[PDB]
Amino acid sequence: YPAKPEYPGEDASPEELSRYYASLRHYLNLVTRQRY
């Protein structure tokens, strides 16, 4: 589980959280290239 933080939810702003979402998606986008 390379960097698997928990999501905030609908607590933060619709833009601020949307930015943070990139860090979450980036993790998955790093797992979408499994090797060995």
* Cα-based distances in Å from 19 to 25, 34, 35: 10, 25, 28
Torsion angle defined by CA atoms of residues 28, 33, 34 and 35, in that order, rounded to the nearest 10 degrees = -160
Rounded to an integer, what distance in angstroms lies between the CA atom of residue 17 and that of residue 6?
12
The Cα-based distances of 13 to 1, 6, 7, 8, 25 in angstroms read: 27, 17, 13, 10, 18
- CB distance 21 to 3 below 8 Å: no
Judged by phi (left if over 0) then psi (alpha if -120 to 50, else beta), residue 3 lies in: left
| Structure token pair of residue 26 | 């980036």
Q: Are 20 and 10 in contact (CB under 8 A)?
A: no
Method by which the model was determined: NMR
Give CA 30 to chain center in angstroms. Answer: 10
Q: What is the DSSP letter of 3?
A: S
